[PDB]
Amino acid sequence: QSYGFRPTYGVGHQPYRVVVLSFELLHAPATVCGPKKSTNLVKNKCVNF
Amino acid sequence: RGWIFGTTLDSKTQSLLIVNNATNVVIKVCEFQFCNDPFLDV
Amino acid sequence: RFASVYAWNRTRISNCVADYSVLYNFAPFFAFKCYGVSPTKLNDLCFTN
Amino acid sequence: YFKIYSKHTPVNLGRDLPQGFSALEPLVDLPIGINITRFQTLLALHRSY
Amino acid sequence: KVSGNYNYLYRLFRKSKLKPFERDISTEIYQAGNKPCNGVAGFNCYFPL
Ligand SMILES: *[C@@H]1O[C@H](CO)[C@@H](O[C@@H]2O[C@H](CO)[C@@H](O)[C@H](O)[C@H]2NC(C)=O)[C@H](O)[C@H]1NC(C)=O
Numbered sequence: 001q002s003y004g005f006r007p008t009y010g011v012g013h014q015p016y017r018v019v020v021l022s023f024e025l026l027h028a029p030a031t032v033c034g035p036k037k038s039t040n041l042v043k044n045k046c047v048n049f
Numbered sequence: 050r051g052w053i054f055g056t057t058l059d060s061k062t063q064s065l066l067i068v069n070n071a072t073n074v075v076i077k078v079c080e081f082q083f084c085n086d087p088f089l090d091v
Numbered sequence: 092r093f094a095s096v097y098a099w100n101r102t103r104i105s106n107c108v109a110d111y112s113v114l115y116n117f118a119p120f121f122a123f124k125c126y127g128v129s130p131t132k133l134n135d136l137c138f139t140n
Numbered sequence: 141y142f143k144i145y146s147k148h149t150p151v152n153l154g155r156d157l158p159q160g161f162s163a164l165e166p167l168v169d170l171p172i173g174i175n176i177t178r179f180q181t182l183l184a185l186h187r188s189y
Numbered sequence: 190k191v192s193g194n195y196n197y198l199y200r201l202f203r204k205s206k207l208k209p210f211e212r213d214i215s216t217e218i219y220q221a222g223n224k225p226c227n228g229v230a231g232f233n234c235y236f237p238l
């Protein structure tokens with residue numbers, strides 16, 4: 001049935017666009033990884049490579 | 050008379066209340082909020 | 092063209108470098124509550140899909 | 141398990157920390173559980189000199 | 190509880206790790222970024238419990 005929206009509607013009736021993310025993180029081959037944006041390089045000074 | 054420990058002072062975190070008297074000591078692990086040691090007595 | 096609730100719009104994500112720190116300007120973000128997996132420690136985890 | 145290593149050496153005659161070797165032994169031990177990074181002491185303020 | 194056993198709490202967000210055998214019982218607001226919040230507990234600053 002109809003689910004129309006009006007701007008005059010107040011809190012509790014305004015349209016709320018909703019997106020939900022589902023994750024299946026488990027012991028399986030990984031396709032997506034969040035990185036550390038990488039840290040820049042240095043020379044001639046002891047570092048943990 | 051005694052010692053005070055803890056961190057961040059305010060009731061946000063806990064603190065220590067080491068103190069001696071005559072033949073007694075009391076310790077209290079409580080969120081003690083204060084500003085100075087002034088333990089009025091003598 | 093956000094789809095209706097009865098016909099929800101599902102998308103599959105493939106092998107990708109996902110940074111969950113640039114999307115903060117994509118929506119007003121009225122509510123960003125999250126479950127057992129924390130949004131703060133979310134860009135250091137690798138997901139199967 | 142708070143440590144109260146202590147000893148009484150009243151052999152001092154005025155010099156601060158006179159050169160000499162002495163041992164310390166704990167008296168009372170008790171764990172409480174707190175991230176301590178602040179230290180303070182209480183003084184006889186009502187009658188000081 | 191048929192309705193909800195909202196009597197137990199547990200933390201998810203901390204600035205760093207935790208040593209062994211201590212407690213981190215405190216009611217503050219997690220920064221969750223450079224975005225500063227003062228007890229607001231809104232977006233970008235989630236209640237640790
Ligand atoms: C040292 O100070 C503590 C508090 O800092 C006091 O403890 C009292 O001890 C007597 C001993 O019977 C109790 O009856 C009182 O109820 C205690 N008072 C409080 C506030 O806890 C006391 O002045 C000293 N401790 C002693 C004597 O054990």
Ligand SMILES: *[C@@H]1O[C@H](CO)[C@@H](O[C@@H]2O[C@H](CO)[C@@H](O)[C@H](O)[C@H]2NC(C)=O)[C@H](O)[C@H]1NC(C)=O
Pocket residue numbers: 092093094099100101102
């Ligand atoms: C669900 O996914 C998206 C999100 O709305 C819809 O749009 C297209 O999705 C495909 C991937 O399947 C993309 O390649 C296109 O670029 C998207 N846009 C367009 C204009 O096609 C998709 O149509 C939705 N599918 C449904 C509702 O069945």
Ligand SMILES: *[C@@H]1O[C@H](CO)[C@@H](O[C@@H]2O[C@H](CO)[C@@H](O)[C@H](O)[C@H]2NC(C)=O)[C@H](O)[C@H]1NC(C)=O
Pocket residue numbers: 056057175176177204205
């Ligand atoms: C004890 O509490 C203090 C509270 O300030 C901690 O100091 C903070 O530590 C975090 C994590 O390293 C960092 O944000 C800063 O080093 C400090 N922040 C502020 C605002 O002072 C201290 O690290 C705690 N100690 C332990 C062992 O957890």
